[PDB]
Structure of Alkaline phosphatase,Chaperone protein DnaJ 2:
Amino acid sequence: MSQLRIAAYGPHGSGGSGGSGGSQDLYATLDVPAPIAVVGGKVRAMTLEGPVEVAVPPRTQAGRKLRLKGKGFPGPAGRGDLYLEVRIT
């Protein structure tokens, strides 16, 4: 119905609520193999609900974090950003 919405990989500044970061932003390690990283697909991410399938976009490169705005916890600026740490295996 609703997966972790990937607001990353579209660097486009405009008149909207982006900022330099979210409120309670958190880095969560995202394991992705080299094939699924380049072509895109799905991977197993760690969540409090258990292992979820995150639909990975194409072009995905090691060391880049998928900043998923609003997927972090609420705070001063509104909600935090969930950075999925692309680990190409």
Observations:
- The chain is about 5% helix and 50% strand.
